[PDB]
Amino acid sequence: HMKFGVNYTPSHGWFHAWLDPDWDGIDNDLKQISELGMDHVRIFPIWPYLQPNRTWINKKGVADVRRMVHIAGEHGLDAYVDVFQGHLSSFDFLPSWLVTWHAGNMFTDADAVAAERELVKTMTDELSKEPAFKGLTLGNAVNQLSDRPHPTKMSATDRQIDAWLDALLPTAAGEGHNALYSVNDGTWFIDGHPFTPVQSATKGDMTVIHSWVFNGIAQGYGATSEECSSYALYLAELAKAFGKDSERPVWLQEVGAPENVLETDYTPEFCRKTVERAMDCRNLWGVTWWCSHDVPASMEDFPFFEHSLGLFDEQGQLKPIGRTFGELAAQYRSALPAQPKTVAVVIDVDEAGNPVNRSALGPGGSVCDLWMKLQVAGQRPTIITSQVAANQEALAQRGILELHADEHPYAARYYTAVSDPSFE
């Protein structure tokens, strides 16, 4: 069974709805989503509304998240909840006790981590009362705060991020639901980034990826190229390469058709092709489209393409990409896992198991260029580390017959870490 769902953006009020929720409108949103054949939603509370003080949790805010989970369960949806937003569509929502006069570091400050731990525990304890609650994500792209290009970064070493993850994820655990975190693609593509590919493929219950072709994939390879619609597949094969466990599932927790780089008329086809190719990774556990509903036009300072990432429009009308994604779910939720792959691109790793050269992995880098060349020639390449490639027994076990290495590496020609040129 392959899971299909959406990242739920409330159609009246966006995530400002938490400040004045239109519950009848939220019910209409979730009914529509369910009637499209989705089996789950991802839900995003706002951190400074849940925890306005380091030692004071907004109990009503928690109850509002529980209510939203409950409504989704009414309509047969499983609910996954991200806690630390944090970052949403280019906006940072940070509690006042971590900014300006109270500038702190949410990854390395002992009492910040303790308060985070307490909120996760409060959230897990309360949401576990809803059968529809199926997993908790530490937060949406929590890594973006930890490094440049972020203009007020909370820097950390990878060892500190190891300790941060090890301090929060066990608190999210419990029977009946998963414990996860998410990162943006800087984890695989930015050198010296403290969130690492090994962490993503070892900590938490599944390997989580967000697939966004405005990072240079559409720009350099071509919006309609096969490379661009194979990019979610490349990310899935890339992320799972760095785990101890070759069977660890991969969750494509975010994937959208951004119209700052794709043509509007092309997005249905882009969606179909991207999903189908992503499903050629046999570790793939599910696909969660970004996003459910257009961001209200009355709201400003969004990069313009964010307003039309929806499967429904602002009036609640189903868009053509929406119809396509619902057709993908009905056809493929019952499909069999993909055949294994016998051709692998090899990535050199250090002793810890992380790429020594991360810049070569991004859009227009030597490793990406190599995988794309092989993919578009029908060689169906998977990805492995140099540690696995050196193990002749593992290779024969995994069935791999042909290895391709990055013979002369180069940095990512196309890569940009931001979604809009005005953030560069």
Ligand X SMILES: CC(=O)N[C@@H]1[C@@H](O)[C@H](O[C@@H]2O[C@H](CO)[C@@H](O)[C@H](O)[C@@H]2O)[C@@H](CO)O[C@H]1O
Closer of 53 and 339 to a second copy (Cβ): 53
Closer of 51 and 200 to a second copy (Cβ): 51
Contact mark string toward ligand X, 308..337, x via CB under 6 A: -x----------------------------
Closer of 42 and 203 to ligand X (Cβ): 42
Residue of 178, 175, 229, 228 whose CA lies nearest to 208: 178
Closer of 49 and 234 to a second copy (Cβ): 49
Cα 296–chain centre separation: 23
Cβ(140)–Cβ(86) below 8 Å: yes
Cβ(306)–Cβ(295) below 8 Å: yes
Closer of 295 and 367 to a second copy (Cβ): 295
Per the document, the length of the chain is: 424
Cβ(213)–Cβ(228) below 8 Å: yes
Q: How far is the CB of 263 from a second copy (least distance, A)?
A: 26
> H or E segment at 40?
strand 40-43
Tokens representing 100 are 């300006």
Interface of this chain with ligand X, residues 274 to 303, rule: CB under 6 A: 290
| Total binding residues toward ligand X, as defined by CB under 6 A | 21
Instruction: Choose the contact partner of 185 out of ligand X, a second copy, none; CB within 5 to 8 A by kind.
Output: ligand X
Interface of this chain with ligand X, residues 181 to 200, rule: CB under 6 A: 184-185
Closer of 69 and 141 to ligand X (Cβ): 141
Peptide bond before residue 174 is cis, with ω within 30 degrees of 0: no
312 DSSP assignment: B
Beta bridge partners of 80: 42, 135
Cα 315–chain centre separation: 27
Which of 20, 101, 301, 408 forms a contact with ligand X (CB under 6 A)? 101
Task: Note whether 261 binds ligand X by CB under 6 A.
Answer: no
Interface of this chain with ligand X, residues 356 to 415, rule: CB under 6 A: none
Tokens representing 40 are 């789950």
318 DSSP assignment: B
Max alpha carbon distance in the chain (Å)? 60
Beta bridge partners of 186: none
Closer of 98 and 344 to ligand X (Cβ): 98
Task: Note whether 304 binds ligand X by CB under 6 A.
Answer: no
Task: Give the three-class secondary structure for 285.
Answer: strand
> H or E segment at 23?
helix 23-35
Q: How far is the CB of 362 from ligand X (least distance, A)?
A: 12
Instruction: Give the up-direction half-sphere exposure of residue 381: CA atoms within 13 A in the CB hemisphere.
Output: 27
Closer of 21 and 73 to a second copy (Cβ): 21
Closer of 133 and 189 to ligand X (Cβ): 189
Instruction: Choose the contact partner of 274 out of a second copy, ligand X, none; CB within 5 to 8 A by kind.
Output: none
Cβ(323)–Cβ(111) below 8 Å: no
Task: Note whether 423 binds ligand X by CB under 6 A.
Answer: yes
Task: Note whether 420 binds ligand X by CB under 6 A.
Answer: yes
Which of 42, 203, 210, 293 forms a contact with ligand X (CB under 6 A)? 210
Tokens representing 141 are 């792209």
Parallel, antiparallel, or unpaired for β 343-347 and 381-385? parallel
Peptide bond before residue 95 is cis, with ω within 30 degrees of 0: no
Which of 227, 254, 259, 280 forms a contact with ligand X (CB under 6 A)? 254
Q: Which residues bind a second copy (CB under 8 A)?
A: 13-14, 16, 19-20, 48-49, 52-56, 58-61, 90-94, 96-97, 99-103, 150-152, 296, 298-301, 423
Judged by CB under 6 A, the stretch of 152-160, 278-286, 373-381, 416-424 that binds ligand X is 416-424
Instruction: Choose the contact partner of 212 out of a second copy, ligand X, none; CB within 5 to 8 A by kind.
Output: ligand X
Task: Note whether 147 binds ligand X by CB under 6 A.
Answer: no
Residue of 77, 50, 46 whose CA lies nearest to 329: 77
Q: How far is the CB of 87 from ligand X (least distance, A)?
A: 6
Which residue matches tokens 């219950």? 205
Closer of 324 and 419 to ligand X (Cβ): 419
List of residues contacting ligand X (CB under 6 A): 87-90, 101, 140-141, 184-185, 210, 212, 254, 256, 290, 306, 309, 417-420, 423
